[PDB]
């Protein structure tokens, strides 16, 4: 996160850090708890991941320093990538992780509500992006979970800023015209969380952008409300 500040412990209790153990253990991406066995994240995070066996999900974390060899984690049973996904910039950048065990909810770890098809009309004015990603374009993963408050921009405006791309209705953009606050490398897969009528909703998933926090280059996020039917289909037992 560029231009953000340190989070308060437990203020984003749906945020997880997804690690890979290959070749040695490191943070791979962010994600969000949406159900007792389910994390919602970005499909592009799984490039070159050939098995869920190398993944570890940690919940209730503020500082990466909390994660040691003796720290409990959730194994991943299954990676479900949207079948239309090809790459982040073409959309469909959404994946589910089915956990091996269920999360016991607590003040430190609990699910975020999905957006309602009914709140598509709502003007979300209280939106935050969070993660352990870079604080500049070439940097490193941060110890403390960062947060930044960022305004949504209309799809028409976002399209004007990305002339070589198609910004579709399945994407949502957020940023300041002057830049300075944005997600960056390592924040991918984490939430864009918006507070409306005293309830937090998972509005976006951090997906892509040109650089980080540049002038006239808003961040691009998966528009989660366009995938609530997909999420329901994929999380039902069969």
Swiss-Prot record:
Effect noted on mutating residue 16 to M: In FA11D; dominant-negative mutation that results in severely decreased protein secretion
Organism, scientific name: Homo sapiens
Residues annotated as glycosylated: 63, 104
Positions contributing to heparin binding: 160-163
Outcome after substituting residue 124 to H: In FA11D; transfected cells contain reduced amount of mutant protein and display decreased secretion
Record domain Peptidase S1: where: 1-236
Catalytic machinery residues: 44, 93, 188
Name under which the protein is recorded: Coagulation factor XIa light chain
Disulfide-bond pairs as recorded: 29-45, 127-194, 158-173, 184-212
């Amino acid at each position: 996160i560029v231009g953000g500040t340190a989070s308060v412990r437990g203020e984003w209790p749906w945020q997880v850090t997804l690690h890979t153990t290959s070749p040695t253990q490191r943070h791979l991406c962010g994600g969000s708890i949406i159900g007792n066995q389910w994390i919602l994240t970005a499909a592009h995070c799984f490039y070159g991941v050939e098995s869920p066996k190398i993944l570890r999900v940690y919940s209730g974390i503020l500082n990466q320093s909390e994660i040691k060899e003796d720290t409990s984690f959730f194994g991943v049973q299954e990676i479900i990538i949207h079948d239309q996904y090809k790459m982040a910039e073409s959309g469909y950048d959404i994946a589910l992780l089915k956990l091996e065990t269920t999360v016991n909810y607590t003040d430190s770890q609990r699910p975020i509500s999905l957006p309602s098809k009914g709140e598509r009309n709502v003007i979300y004015t209280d939106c935050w992006v969070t993660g352990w990603g870079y604080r500049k374009l070439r940097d490193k993963i941060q110890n403390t979970l960062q947060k930044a408050k960022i305004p949504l921009v209309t799809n028409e405006e976002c399209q004007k800023r990305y002339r070589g791309h198609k910004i579709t209705h399945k994407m949502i953009c957020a940023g300041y015209r002057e830049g300075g606050k944005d997600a960056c490398k390592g924040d991918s897969g984490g939430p864009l969380s918006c507070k409306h009528n005293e309830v937090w909703h998972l509005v976006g998933i951090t997906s892509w952008g040109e650089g980080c926090a540049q002038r006239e280059r808003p961040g691009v996020y998966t528009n989660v409300v366009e995938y609530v039917d997909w999420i329901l289909e994929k999380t039902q037992a069969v």
